[PDB]
Amino acid sequence: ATFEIVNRCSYTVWAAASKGDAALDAGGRQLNSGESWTINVEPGTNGGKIWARTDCYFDDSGSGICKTGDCGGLLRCKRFGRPPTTLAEFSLNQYGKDYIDISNIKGFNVPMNFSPTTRGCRGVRCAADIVGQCPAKLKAPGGGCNDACTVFQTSEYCCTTGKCGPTEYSRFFKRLCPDAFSYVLDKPTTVTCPGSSNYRVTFCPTA
């Protein structure tokens, strides 16, 4: 499937794409404001994620650091990034269907729209000013709004026993972004699309 990743923000982001144990395509690239990067993702890819990283410095060998979403210091991500990160998540060609969602379970750094570019489903978006409204205990110095599991490391926020309810913190993400997952057991906001759809992820879609 092809994904077009578009940076509509007024600042540079470093896009990242990984399935957690491997890069998707080149795995990461710098995107200046307006730039589009088209990647190819193998059919049957399960558990892929796309995110933006902010305020990165890399050297000639593609090693360095980002203030949000850093994936072990690499330009080309092999692993998932460090919260806070707004996430586009996808499982492709799973018994004839593609499944897509946006998640705030690992926090929020950059607003995002995640839409099919082919026919037969609708897109999802979380474009509210979560960083501006972020509760004081969740604000990350780096920039961004952390999830409560990251900050506090409790069974309730991390849903580690597999039983957890919504919280004051999860309700904050859900109030501003009803179409994104706000905690591990949130009522799913997954969208089912036809198998082998194509997609665009746009950072700062309302810019």
Which CATH topology does 1-207 take? Thaumatin (2.60.110)
Question: Could you tell me if 142 and 153 are in contact, meaning their C-beta atoms sit under 8 angstroms apart?
Answer: no
Task: State yes or no: cis peptide before 84, omega within 30 of 0.
Answer: yes
Mention every residue, 6+ apart, whose C-beta is less than 8 A from residue 5: 15, 17, 31, 36, 37, 38, 39, 50, 200, 201, 203
The whole-angstrom separation of Cα 4 and Cα 37 is 6
Of 160, 183, 187, give the one whose Cα is nearest residue 172. 183
As a three-state string, the secondary structure of the chain is CEEEEEECCCCCEEEEEECCCCEEEEEEEEECCCCEEEEECCCCCCCEEEEEEEEEEECCCCEEEEEECCCCCECCCCCCCCCCCCEEEEEEEECCEEEEEEECCCCECCCEEEEECCCCCCCEEECCCHHHHCCHHHECCCCCECCHHHHHCCHHHHCCCCCCCCCHHHHHHHHHCCCEECCCCCCCCCEEEECCCCEEEEECCCC
